[PDB]
Each structure stands twice: as structure tokens, then as C-alpha cells.
Motif scaffolding. Structure first.
Motif, PDB file in Angstrom:
ATOM      1  N   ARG A 141      -4.718  -3.067  -6.993  1.00 34.97           N
ATOM      2  CA  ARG A 141      -3.392  -2.634  -6.636  1.00 34.97           C
ATOM      3  C   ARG A 141      -2.317  -3.470  -7.316  1.00 34.97           C
ATOM      4  O   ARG A 141      -2.467  -4.685  -7.503  1.00 34.97           O
ATOM      5  CB  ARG A 141      -3.205  -2.681  -5.128  1.00 34.97           C
ATOM      6  CG  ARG A 141      -3.778  -1.473  -4.428  1.00 34.97           C
ATOM      7  CD  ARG A 141      -3.487  -1.591  -2.965  1.00 34.97           C
ATOM      8  NE  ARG A 141      -3.898  -0.425  -2.200  1.00 34.97           N
ATOM      9  CZ  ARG A 141      -4.325  -0.482  -0.938  1.00 34.97           C
ATOM     10  NH1 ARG A 141      -4.426  -1.663  -0.311  1.00 34.97           N
ATOM     11  NH2 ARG A 141      -4.678   0.631  -0.315  1.00 34.97           N
ATOM     12  N   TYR A 188       1.474  -5.069  -7.355  1.00 33.85           N
ATOM     13  CA  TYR A 188       2.557  -5.546  -6.517  1.00 33.85           C
ATOM     14  C   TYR A 188       3.634  -6.199  -7.354  1.00 33.85           C
ATOM     15  O   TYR A 188       3.371  -6.714  -8.444  1.00 33.85           O
ATOM     16  CB  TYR A 188       2.058  -6.551  -5.495  1.00 33.85           C
ATOM     17  CG  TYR A 188       1.093  -5.962  -4.525  1.00 33.85           C
ATOM     18  CD1 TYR A 188       1.550  -5.301  -3.406  1.00 33.85           C
ATOM     19  CD2 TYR A 188      -0.266  -6.052  -4.724  1.00 33.85           C
ATOM     20  CE1 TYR A 188       0.675  -4.743  -2.505  1.00 33.85           C
ATOM     21  CE2 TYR A 188      -1.164  -5.479  -3.817  1.00 33.85           C
ATOM     22  CZ  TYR A 188      -0.665  -4.837  -2.695  1.00 33.85           C
ATOM     23  OH  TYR A 188      -1.487  -4.230  -1.759  1.00 33.85           O
ATOM     24  N   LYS A 209       8.831  -2.255   0.572  1.00 30.44           N
ATOM     25  CA  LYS A 209       7.930  -2.673   1.628  1.00 30.44           C
ATOM     26  C   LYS A 209       7.438  -4.094   1.375  1.00 30.44           C
ATOM     27  O   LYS A 209       7.098  -4.434   0.238  1.00 30.44           O
ATOM     28  CB  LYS A 209       6.747  -1.697   1.726  1.00 30.44           C
ATOM     29  CG  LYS A 209       5.678  -2.154   2.704  1.00 30.44           C
ATOM     30  CD  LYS A 209       4.889  -1.004   3.315  1.00 30.44           C
ATOM     31  CE  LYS A 209       3.760  -1.524   4.234  1.00 30.44           C
ATOM     32  NZ  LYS A 209       4.221  -2.631   5.143  1.00 30.44           N
ATOM     33  N   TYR A 259       4.406  -6.337   1.946  1.00 35.21           N
ATOM     34  CA  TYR A 259       2.984  -6.246   2.273  1.00 35.21           C
ATOM     35  C   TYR A 259       2.329  -7.544   2.756  1.00 35.21           C
ATOM     36  O   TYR A 259       1.417  -7.507   3.588  1.00 35.21           O
ATOM     37  CB  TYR A 259       2.229  -5.779   1.055  1.00 35.21           C
ATOM     38  CG  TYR A 259       2.497  -4.349   0.705  1.00 35.21           C
ATOM     39  CD1 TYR A 259       1.727  -3.339   1.252  1.00 35.21           C
ATOM     40  CD2 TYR A 259       3.488  -4.004  -0.202  1.00 35.21           C
ATOM     41  CE1 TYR A 259       1.960  -2.008   0.924  1.00 35.21           C
ATOM     42  CE2 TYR A 259       3.721  -2.671  -0.531  1.00 35.21           C
ATOM     43  CZ  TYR A 259       2.939  -1.693   0.016  1.00 35.21           C
ATOM     44  OH  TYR A 259       3.135  -0.343  -0.292  1.00 35.21           O
ATOM     45  N   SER A 309       6.364  -3.914  -2.664  1.00 34.56           N
ATOM     46  CA  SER A 309       6.051  -2.710  -3.447  1.00 34.56           C
ATOM     47  C   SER A 309       6.812  -2.813  -4.734  1.00 34.56           C
ATOM     48  O   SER A 309       7.901  -3.348  -4.762  1.00 34.56           O
ATOM     49  CB  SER A 309       6.403  -1.394  -2.715  1.00 34.56           C
ATOM     50  OG  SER A 309       7.624  -1.498  -2.019  1.00 34.56           O
ATOM     51  N   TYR A 310       6.178  -2.369  -5.810  1.00 32.48           N
ATOM     52  CA  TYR A 310       6.761  -2.390  -7.126  1.00 32.48           C
ATOM     53  C   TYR A 310       7.639  -1.161  -7.309  1.00 32.48           C
ATOM     54  O   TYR A 310       7.151  -0.055  -7.195  1.00 32.48           O
ATOM     55  CB  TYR A 310       5.633  -2.410  -8.142  1.00 32.48           C
ATOM     56  CG  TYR A 310       6.017  -2.262  -9.579  1.00 32.48           C
ATOM     57  CD1 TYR A 310       7.213  -2.771 -10.063  1.00 32.48           C
ATOM     58  CD2 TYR A 310       5.168  -1.616 -10.465  1.00 32.48           C
ATOM     59  CE1 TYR A 310       7.540  -2.667 -11.386  1.00 32.48           C
ATOM     60  CE2 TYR A 310       5.489  -1.515 -11.801  1.00 32.48           C
ATOM     61  CZ  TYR A 310       6.686  -2.029 -12.246  1.00 32.48           C
ATOM     62  OH  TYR A 310       7.034  -1.928 -13.566  1.00 32.48           O
ATOM     63  N   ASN A 323      11.586   4.015  -7.128  1.00 35.09           N
ATOM     64  CA  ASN A 323      10.155   3.979  -7.363  1.00 35.09           C
ATOM     65  C   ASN A 323       9.740   4.954  -8.465  1.00 35.09           C
ATOM     66  O   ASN A 323      10.590   5.599  -9.092  1.00 35.09           O
ATOM     67  CB  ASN A 323       9.371   4.229  -6.067  1.00 35.09           C
ATOM     68  CG  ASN A 323       9.606   5.598  -5.450  1.00 35.09           C
ATOM     69  OD1 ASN A 323      10.111   6.516  -6.071  1.00 35.09           O
ATOM     70  ND2 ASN A 323       9.168   5.739  -4.197  1.00 35.09           N
ATOM     71  N   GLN A 340      14.668   2.753  -3.041  1.00 37.97           N
ATOM     72  CA  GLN A 340      13.923   1.635  -2.495  1.00 37.97           C
ATOM     73  C   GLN A 340      14.954   0.512  -2.349  1.00 37.97           C
ATOM     74  O   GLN A 340      15.193  -0.241  -3.279  1.00 37.97           O
ATOM     75  CB  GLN A 340      12.773   1.230  -3.428  1.00 37.97           C
ATOM     76  CG  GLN A 340      11.621   2.268  -3.617  1.00 37.97           C
ATOM     77  CD  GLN A 340      10.633   2.296  -2.464  1.00 37.97           C
ATOM     78  OE1 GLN A 340       9.616   1.575  -2.466  1.00 37.97           O
ATOM     79  NE2 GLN A 340      10.925   3.131  -1.463  1.00 37.97           N
TER      80      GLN A 340
END
Ligand SMILES: Nc1ncnc2c1ncn2[C@@H]1O[C@H](COP(=O)(O)OP(=O)(O)OP(=O)(O)O)[C@@H](O)[C@H]1O
Ligand SMILES: O=C(O)/C=C(/CCc1ccc(Cl)cc1)c1ccc(-c2ccccc2)cc1
Length: 284
Positions: free
Chosen positions: A31, A33, A69, A71, A85-86, A139, A145
Motif C-alpha cells: 500500500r 501512503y 485520512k 491511518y 492517504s496519498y 485524490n 481531500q
């Protein structure tokens, strides 16, 4: 708790005055980030710890499609890491500058998302205090975002707190009440909203000058103009948000909240439910 060796770092996404954001892949999941990193020595030296803690605390409370977000978090001996979140498509400001202004359909759509976000944020009793295109990222799907919560305020529900006393913000978007009364309220974000809508259509924010003091003077006098061609219902909306009296802005608690704002004729065609699942209009 994750560790830095749990990731592979790639390119640097940006650099703040005491932070670095870096693109990272988590080895165990693949994933992606965006990891925000601050040096403990620097924040310890420059008295920034309350901002770091604030950012963490405020972002821990948010659970909504129109916010970055948080995480995970961790630390080592030198650094503090915030796993986010990227936002692949970066800042809204970039698009404003690139195309110069948004057409009516795009202005409506992105304004609607920001209203939706602020309805959520204010419902949780949180003031942003630095809302501006630079802090609204996009995003991969070109949904918004919102970010930068180190200068946000959680209002205390125990005391029914309404006003925040810390002096924070950005000169172009700062509310007249923080300048004159030395406190901000939820409605201070609606003033910023008016500035941003203006900026989307006009290509520049409404109060502008080559130094902050001059801007302050224009703000407290409501000294600004609309360009000849400005979508009329959007102009009406802006004139209902850029109001010196913070209790008279459309969307504020004293005006009975987000219902009347979402009912504004500028949003007639908006479907407010599952906004985050609609395909955004192309900016073109
Ligand atoms: N989650 C993210 N996804 C993609 N890019 C991001 C993300 N978070 C931040 N960035 C980018 O990295 C840049 C630096 O962010 P950071 O919050 O570290 O500093 P800043 O707030 O820009 O600087 P300052 O503290 O001086 O205001 C941001 O301006 C933004 O463009
Ligand atoms: O994650 C954790 O498990 C713990 C913390 C709190 C630990 C902590 C210890 C010393 C100092 Cl000077 C600051 C924070 C933490 C870590 C990262 C952030 C952070 C916030 C914003 C940007 C970057 C990192 C904040 C608190």
C-alpha cells in the motif's frame, strides 16, 4: 505500531517549514501512503509540539471522504511520523493557477464538496481556521481531500465553547472577527469559503495586496469588487458569506446551519447525497 523500516520511501511530495512529506510503500501490503515526518529536535527547539499534537489529535477524529485520512503514527529517536492517504493530484490551487478560473459546473461541484466537508467538520465541533486552496488536496479521482489540521480547534462540548482564542490563519482568508475580536468561530470557516468561491470564479482571492497589513485593512472594511462577468447566483452566494457579522453568514449556527446554505439557488442542481461517489466534472 509500524516502524520506518516497515516502509520503502520514494519521492518527496513536499516540504513544510518543519516537516517533510514523502511517498512511501508499506512492504507487507504494497500500500501507498504519504508520510509526514518531523524532526523531534526541530519541533523541540522551535516550540511546535502543540501543533504536532494538535494535528494528530484532530485528524484522529475525522472519518469522512473529503478529508485526508490518518491511518497510523509512530516515532523513533529522531523523528515523528504521520501515515496519511496519498492525494495523488495535489493542491486545488495548482488547478486554479493552471486554468485561471473554473467554469460554473466545476465551481458548483467543488464548492458543494467543500460545503459538505465543512458541514461534517462543524458537526463535530471543529473549526479548521486555515481553509484555503493550498490546503484542499485532490485524490486520484479528483475528489477533495482537505488537510492541515495542526491549527484546527476542537471546541469543548462540556462548556458549549463557541469561540477559539489562538491566533492562526492565512492573511488572504482570515476572518474579520479574528482580526478585530481576537477570536475565531465555526463561521470563520464560512468566510474562508466565500473567499475560495470567489477565487474559483475570479482567479484570485477577493482581498489581496503585497503585504498582510493592507489585506487586513481591506478585510475589516469589506473592501472588494466582483469582476464584470461573475456567475450571478455564485455572486449572490459570495455576498451571503462575506459578511462582517459572523452571526449573519449563510450556513452559520445563528442562521440555522447548513440546511439553508445547501438550499441556496447556486446549488439547485446538486445532489448532496453520495457526492463523493459522483464523477467530478473535468476542469478543461
Ligand atoms: N496527504 C498528502 N498527499 C499528497 N501531498 C501532500 C499530503 N500532505 C501534504 N502534502 C503536500 O506536501 C506539502 C508539505 O506539507 P506539510 O504539511 O509538511 O507542510 P505545509 O503545511 O505545506 O508547510 P507549512 O507548515 O509551511 O504550512 C503540502 O504543501 C502538500 O502540497
Ligand atoms: O505516534 C505515536 O505513537 C506518538 C506520538 C506522540 C509521541 C511524541 C513524543 C515526543 C514528542 Cl517531542 C512528540 C510526540 C506522535 C507521533 C507523531 C506525531 C506527528 C504529528 C504530526 C506530524 C508528524 C507526526 C504526533 C504524535
Amino acid at each position: 505500531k509500524k516502524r520506518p523500516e516497515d516502509f520503502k520511501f520514494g519521492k518527496i511530495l513536499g516540504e513544510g517549514s518543519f516537516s517533510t512529506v514523502v511517498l512511501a510503500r508499506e512492504l507487507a501490503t504494497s500500500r501507498e501512503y504519504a508520510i509526514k515526518i518531523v524532526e523531534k529536535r526541530h519541533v523541540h527547539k522551535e516550540n511546535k509540539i502543540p501543533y504536532v499534537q494538535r494535528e494528530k489529535d484532530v485528524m484522529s477524529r475525522l472519518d469522512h471522504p473529503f478529508f485526508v485520512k490518518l491511518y497510523f503514527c509512530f516515532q523513533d529517536d529522531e523523528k515523528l511520523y504521520l501515515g496519511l492517504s496519498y492525494a495523488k493530484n495535489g493542491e486545488l490551487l495548482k488547478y486554479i493557477r493552471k486554468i485561471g478560473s473554473f467554469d460554473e459546473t466545476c465551481t458548483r461541484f467543488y464548492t458543494a464538496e467543500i460545503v459538505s466537508a465543512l458541514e461534517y467538520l462543524h458537526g463535530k465541533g471543529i473549526i479548521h481556521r486555515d481553509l484555503k486552496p493550498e490546503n484542499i488536496l485532490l485524490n486520484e479521482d479528483m475528489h477533495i481531500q482537505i488537510t492541515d489540521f495542526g491549527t484546527a480547534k476542537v471546541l469543548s462540548p462540556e462548556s458549549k465553547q463557541a469561540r477559539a482564542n489562538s491566533f492562526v490563519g492565512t492573511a488572504q482568508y482570515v476572518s474579520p472577527e479574528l482580526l478585530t475580536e481576537k477570536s475565531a468561530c465555526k463561521s470563520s470557516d464560512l468566510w474562508a469559503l466565500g473567499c475560495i468561491i470567489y477565487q474559483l470564479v475570479a482567479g484570485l482571492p477577493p482581498f489581496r495586496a503585497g503585504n498582510e497589513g493592507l489585506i487586513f485593512a481591506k478585510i475589516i472594511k469589506l473592501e472588494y469588487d466582483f469582476p464584470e462577468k461573475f456567475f450571478p447566483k455564485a455572486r449572490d452566494l459570495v455576498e451571503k458569506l462575506l459578511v462582517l457579522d459572523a452571526t449573519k453568514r449563510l450556513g452559520c449556527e445563528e442562521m440555522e446551519g447548513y440546511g439553508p446554505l445547501k438550499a441556496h439557488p447556486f446549488f439547485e442542481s446538486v445532489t448532496w447525497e453520495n457526492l463523493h461517489q459522483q464523477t467530478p466534472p473535468k476542469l478543461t
